[PDB]
Design a protein around this ligand. Structure first.
Ligand code: BGC
Ligand code: BGC
Ligand code: CA
Ligand code: CA
Ligand code: CA
Ligand code: CA
Ligand code: CA
Ligand code: CA
Lengths: 374, 374
């Protein structure tokens, strides 16, 4: 079952199949840890696309059923096969490009892994289908929009030497981060004509502490030990993603509530989104604020250290979820900056630009559709 | 004052100046945090070079006097200007490539920074002189030796799926680390024909703790607080380089001695090299061993997390100092592996290759001489 807008649109598209140019269109997929989205774009649609379906899926067998279903649906409306496909997924891709491993899907290896050869040929031509990482897809989307001087349509400066200027990327490196089901991290590279994308897995590196004289030192130690207990039985130091994610905000929230002996089962049951919204009212939901503060504090800490290690010129906070959290970010700007410049080498990152996405736009789908064209 | 071997060699070289091909030679420089080395290679010397001078220097004004001096000395023996130069230095390089900032030199900005335009024209042709980072130079050296199938002449596998094979680099990413005056880190990249080098500053990122149930958790906290006290007055979390370096091994050693109330001023005064040598006798110098253990433990911890974040296929422990520490590494292999695979995502790094440099060879100079040729 497809929507009216999609149905009417595909009817307009298919008249071109009996034209000289034919109907050449491409498939793009954003496989997130919680939701998957699929979109189509014709050869001439250069900055736009048609989202045909989204689904809540946390294993690959359910994706296969979604792909089969939506493939048959588009086939009944277009007739003509897709000319190329790219799936940007929230995990790692095998050296041969054949297999995606979705890091935060649940179950055994079969339910976390997705092979190209399992995909329906209609939407996923066997020789013209590629896997990329989701943040790798974000970078191609960003690079594509930077090339057509359009990044200012969905990004805004939060600080840095370029913050009075319209958003545009210089030929240096830029770090891209996205907070969602997981912590996504990639880098736009300018080494040696264009931007090269490097996919990364830095959301899973062990966290760093604060200085022993920091006022948050005792309480951060308790939070890290609490999370390390619940996830790893204290055997490992937690990953940044164990805090900087949806479930991470939820578990930090439960820690804030345990230290305050707040037994209220209603405030106890909120999901990441309600905690995050509640946090924009500092005086009326102080516990949501405290958890969100620590959530974004650790996002600033991993971003700080990657800026130093990668020697980037700027960084971009991306994702549609980030749009809803920019208000919290501005309400707590000093607290975030205090964290970001808390480093012996703070002089090195004083001139780092920070951009944040301000309008909902699925940069992953744009990136996947850029790759799918070849 | 140049040596006999260098003097005799340059006399042999200069006969070619009155030949059809002329005398085209290139300058390479390895500017370390403690020592600087300079070398020459002719156009046809593809895997060899002539080291003409090394000096102990910890500020750039002393380097300028060394460069001026050795430039005039080579000029009096060769007559003909150098055709190209590259300086691989232990720090950052400005966007315009004009200025090197040596991270661990002492003094004000003038004594830590070195401009191209301050270099003698004879050895450093104004339009044909380039700055690279020292580990960036290491990678070009490694890549150069991999291209001529020669890495097995100075690297040996310590573990991984390729450890029965002769050392050769696949077309994937490789992390390169070197422990010396500082912690040097760069990455050989295979994105998209060849290896691309990415320079990095990851030695300066904040450390990670162990899991709260680890037997070393209480004592690591004391060590981190001790170093954070002495370097930063507890205001910052220490950098990996604050432990994984010469001065880091020395300060860890002093901490081991303080916790044992060892007042002996003779054992108290050892420099990094004597501590490291003493450490290869576990039963006779147990304190040196304990400090060296923690030294290499934190090297394994930063390497573990960078392998995860960068998704490399292998890593190389490089530098001439590493040669003298491989014995310690093999005596304490289980302790190092216990640290390296201590991660929730340990399955991801199970198949990572580890190589370590086994013969002294200045890979920085090879790399700089590769760049100097254009
Ligand atoms: O989706 C955000 C990120 O989530 C992480 O848990 C995955 O390992 C990454 O591959 C992904 O980019
Ligand atoms: O020499 C090893 C490393 O030392 C560090 O302190 C510097 O910041 C790096 O640029 C250098 O590569
Ligand atoms: Ca077909
Ligand atoms: Ca640049
Ligand atoms: Ca327990
Ligand atoms: Ca000249
Ligand atoms: Ca490859
Ligand atoms: Ca103090």
């Amino acid at each position: 079952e497809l929507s009216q807008e999609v149905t009417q649109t595909l009817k307009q598209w298919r008249v071109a199949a009996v034209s000289s140019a034919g109907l050449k269109y491409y498939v793009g997929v954003d496989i997130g840890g919680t939701n998957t989205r699929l979109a189509l774009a014709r050869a001439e649609d250069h900055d736009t696309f048609l989202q045909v379906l989204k689904v809540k899926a946390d294993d690959t067998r359910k994706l296969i059923a979604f792909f089969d279903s939506v493939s048959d649906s588009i086939r009944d409306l277009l007739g003509v096969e897709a000319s190329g496909a790219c799936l940007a997924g929230a995990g790692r891709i095998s050296p041969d490009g054949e297999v995606l491993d979705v890091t935060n899907f649940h179950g055994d290896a079969t339910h976390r892994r997705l092979k190209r050869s399992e995909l329906p040929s209609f939407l996923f031509p066997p020789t013209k289908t590629h896997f990329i990482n989701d943040l790798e897809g974000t970078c191609y989307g960003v690079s594509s929009m930077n090339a057509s001087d359009a990044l200012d349509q969905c990004f805004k400066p939060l600080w840095g030497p370029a913050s009075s200027d319209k958003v545009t990327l210089q030929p240096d490196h830029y770090l891209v981060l996205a907070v969602g089901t997981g912590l996504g991290i990639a880098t736009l590279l300018s080494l040696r004509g264009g931007f090269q994308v490097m996919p990364m897995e830095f959301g899973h590196v062990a966290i760093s502490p604060v200085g022993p004289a920091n006022a948050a030192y005792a309480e951060e130690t308790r939070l890290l030990e609490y999370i390390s207990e619940k996830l790893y039985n204290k055997e490992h130091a937690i990953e940044y993603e164990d805090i900087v994610s949806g479930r991470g905000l939820v578990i930090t929230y439960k820690w804030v509530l345990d230290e305050a002996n707040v037994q209220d089962e209603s405030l106890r049951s909120l999901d990441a989104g309600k905690i995050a919204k509640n946090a924009t009212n500092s005086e009326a939901c102080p516990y949501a604020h405290k958890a969100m503060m620590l959530h974004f504090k650790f996002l600033m800490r991993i971003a700080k250290n990657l800026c130093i290690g990668l020697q980037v010129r700027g960084m971009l906070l991306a994702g549609d979820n980030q749009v809803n959290n920019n208000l919290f970010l501005e309400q707590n700007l000093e607290s975030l900056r205090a964290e970001f410049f808390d480093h012996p080498k703070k002089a090195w990152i004083e001139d780092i630009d920070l951009f944040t996405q301000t309008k909902p736009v699925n940069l992953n789908l744009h990136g996947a559709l850029y790759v799918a064209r070849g």
